[PDB]
Design a binder for this molecule. Structure first.
Ligand SMILES: C/C(O)=C(/O)C1=Nc2c(nc(N)[nH]c2=O)NC1
Ligand SMILES: C/C(O)=C(/O)C1=Nc2c(nc(N)[nH]c2=O)NC1
Ligand SMILES: C/C(O)=C(/O)C1=Nc2c(nc(N)[nH]c2=O)NC1
Ligand SMILES: C/C(O)=C(/O)C1=Nc2c(nc(N)[nH]c2=O)NC1
Ligand SMILES: C/C(O)=C(/O)C1=Nc2c(nc(N)[nH]c2=O)NC1
Ligand SMILES: C/C(O)=C(/O)C1=Nc2c(nc(N)[nH]c2=O)NC1
Ligand SMILES: [Zn+2]
Ligand SMILES: [Zn+2]
Ligand SMILES: [Zn+2]
Ligand SMILES: [Zn+2]
Ligand SMILES: [Zn+2]
Ligand SMILES: [Zn+2]
Lengths: 118, 121, 119, 120, 120, 119
């Protein structure tokens, strides 16, 4: 048994609709968002891996393309695009494709983030 | 386990020395580091806010402790007479857990390549 | 002389209005922008510095707070908010209050950037 | 309650993956700047205020580190299929006997891709 | 002088070995690195596009050379029989300058802490 | 036109700035993980393919590095006012005799700021 992870960065705009009126997050802004997908499972004795890192990247690509260079709030389910909401939303998009998914981390900035484990 | 965790990272610039190491050990000399602290909290996400707590509330809760550490000599702070990573991590937990009840871990990195994670529950 | 620099990070939305339909930069998006301010000058013999890093931060603060947590295209002069335009714009905003400014770098992502020198 | 210590090491090596399909890039001879994080979990001594000195963990790993660094991994027995997963297991198997409090080994082949192994 | 410069960074994973170091020198054993290459260009900013050239255009121009380097053994590429950072930075300049006429410098880093800049 | 080599080193040290005003935070005893970049410029030898081995640059700096690392800077002669600016010049002065091709010294007290000295 082991864990594997792969990291991705996407460039997007968002705003938080439910913060108080003068809160900076309530203004239209953006971030270089980092996403880490983590899987946990058994290592195949012939391949020597769980799945190819490239399969994890390929599995994310359709979701990446929806998020990257986009305004998140216009995506159904991301009307309140906090890191927490986004981590769970990503889990829900990728879990069908990556059944070994064990954690999704979203970082809005280099110093803050959240980790969702479904 | 199933969970949702939030974390926020802070950096502070401080001097320390380790008082119990062998004579001549480099840690025994007055020196310092760019310390990194990561506070992690575990909780439920409110359906209206969409968050556990605002990152800014975490930063504000930590501020008093942060200001005691930054641009200071750690050995002068009570509880930090032996200011190892491990001692500092637990000390920070003890200071913060009262104002951040959902605190689940404290990480302290003395350098970019070496550190400690403390879970106090 | 000696050169000093300091890095600032701001979180902002932008959109490039003059790219072809379909170009990714033409959609409303954002980045965590990095700005490096570089200054060059004489080190005072008594202070041991050119200017305090904090004095540089304070000088930039007004301009920083126009950029951070904002949509760049709404700022006059940033209607086409490329890295190149933004670096020159920051130079033009900051040079009056930091006469020793020698270069401005803007990075939209960690792996690329622009450097402008206005003299 | 628990305390975990960790230290990161970087080594410069070549490898190739022998069991990937014909034209897979990882099947060609190449290399990486590999990063290894060793994590320890255990009691912190009330006198020393640490689990063990970072320097002692470095020393414990040094023999294995020197086998890896500036080498071709496939040549090392046990690393004939030197995936991140296999390497992390292998490092654990070398280091656990010297550092019984070892609780995880992370290997990153690149800055964006990695695996964490936590024992058998 | 008054000027605008752009740069973009690319990382490739490759093996190399230095053939002219003394027997025993670590760099003379087959090994590898996650190499970083930065291309710097300088030119006028077009008043319509607001840019010198699109970052994507610089990436595209470099791709053929990038593909020769990534997931390969450098010593087997003609011109890179002695694949030092110095030699590699110049070799990259020679490959890229014809397709990126605004190219002003090439940086190679073999590790995160050591590298070389060539200006032609 | 030129080939430049560089190598980065990190050392862990205490310092305080003695000529800032009372209550300025840098006036309190503190420390940093300092980063130093040494740069050299010169001809690439066709036989070795290098200017000097990165390992030679590290060895040449080691004595100076060992004075700095895990020490209190203010007690080192020359570093009574251990600003980044003063430190970069001091390192230059210490290193230039054993690294004649030295062309720049950068010092960073934190990851977001620094100083470059070029002689
Ligand atoms: C300041 C800023 O730009 C935001 O996007 C914030 N986002 C969050 C936030 N706190 C949490 N928990 N989650 C968040 O996603 N605070 C601010
Ligand atoms: C070298 C240096 O400057 C220190 O501050 C050291 N600190 C620790 C250490 N080991 C542990 N476990 N914890 C530490 O905090 N070793 C050295
Ligand atoms: C992809 C994206 O989000 C952008 O903002 C781009 N910006 C620039 C760019 N190229 C230059 N030169 N300047 C840029 O500012 N390409 C893309
Ligand atoms: C692309 C490249 O250079 C490789 O070394 C790959 N390695 C792995 C890999 N996938 C897993 N799971 N583990 C690996 O170790 N994919 C590619
Ligand atoms: C240790 C190692 O793996 C190497 O690749 C070395 N490369 C160089 C080197 N020195 C220079 N100047 N250039 C180099 O390219 N030293 C070692
Ligand atoms: C805040 C702090 O800990 C310091 O060490 C400072 N150092 C400098 C500084 N400014 C310059 N120019 N040089 C410095 O070296 N400001 C503060
Ligand atoms: Zn935001
Ligand atoms: Zn220390
Ligand atoms: Zn953009
Ligand atoms: Zn590989
Ligand atoms: Zn090498
Ligand atoms: Zn300081």
């Amino acid at each position: 048994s082991t864990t594997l992870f792969k990291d991705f960065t996407f460039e997007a705009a968002h705003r938080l609709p439910h913060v108080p009126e003068g809160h900076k997050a309530g203004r239209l802004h953006g971030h270089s968002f980092m996403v880490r997908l983590e899987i946990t499972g058994e290592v195949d004795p012939h391949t020597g891996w769980i799945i190819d890192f490239a399969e994890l990247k390929a599995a994310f690509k359709p979701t990446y393309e929806r998020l990257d260079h986009h305004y998140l709030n216009d995506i159904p389910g991301l009307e309140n695009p906090t890191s927490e909401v986004l981590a769970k939303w990503i889990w829900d998009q990728v879990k069908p494709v990556v059944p070994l998914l064990s954690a999704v981390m979203v970082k809005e900035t280099c110093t803050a983030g959240c980790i969702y484990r479904g």
